[PDB]
Amino acid sequence: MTMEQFLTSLDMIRSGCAPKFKLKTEDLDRLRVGDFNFPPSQDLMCYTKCVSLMAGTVNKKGEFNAPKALAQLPHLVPPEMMEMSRKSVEACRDTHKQFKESCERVYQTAKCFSENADGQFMWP
Numbered sequence: 668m669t670m671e672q673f674l675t676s677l678d679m680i681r682s683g684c685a686p687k688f689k690l691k692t693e694d695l696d697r698l699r700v701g702d703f704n705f706p707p708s709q710d711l712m713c714y715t716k717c718v719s720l721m722a723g724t725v726n727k728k729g730e731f732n733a734p735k736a737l738a739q740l741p742h743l744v745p746p747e748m749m750e751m752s753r754k755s756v757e758a759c760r761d762t763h764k765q766f767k768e769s770c771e772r773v774y775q776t777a778k779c780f781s782e783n784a785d786g787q788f789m790w791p
């Protein structure tokens with residue numbers, strides 16, 4: 668995946684997920700630049716779950732599949748983001764176990780990624 672293909676994938680994942688939820692574009696803009704420092708609505712949390720379901724890296728219960736996420740990295744991120752993404756996944760592989768509710772499990776995993784990344788981090 669090239670960087671151009673990655674940037675395109677962000678918008679195509681957004682376009683598949685956003686229309687299923689009542690969201691604020693401003694909130695999406697913040698997640699897109701890796702800024703998760705605000706209380707998410709329930710729909711925003713479930714949007715992060717929708718995105719992760721599209722990648723196949725969570726199940727319906729919001730449980731994160733770290734082995735699958737790691738194996739899928741070459742298909743999800745460009746080469747220049749591979750090592751940073753691997754370390755993010757490893758740092759956050761168990762985050763979901765700390766929460767009871769499906770959407771929140773995914774949201775908190777994504778927030779954990781955002782805290783264990785570099786400046787290349789972007790969320791769809």
Ligand SMILES: CCCCCC/C=C\CCCCCCCCCCOC(C)=O
Pocket residue numbers: 718719722724725731736737743744748751752753755756773776777780784788789790791
């Ligand atoms: C499995 C994705 C690796 C995330 C590690 C953080 C590094 C870079 C962020 C760019 C990746 C975002 C676009 C890929 C969408 C898959 C999101 C999966 O996230 C979860 C919680 O399953």
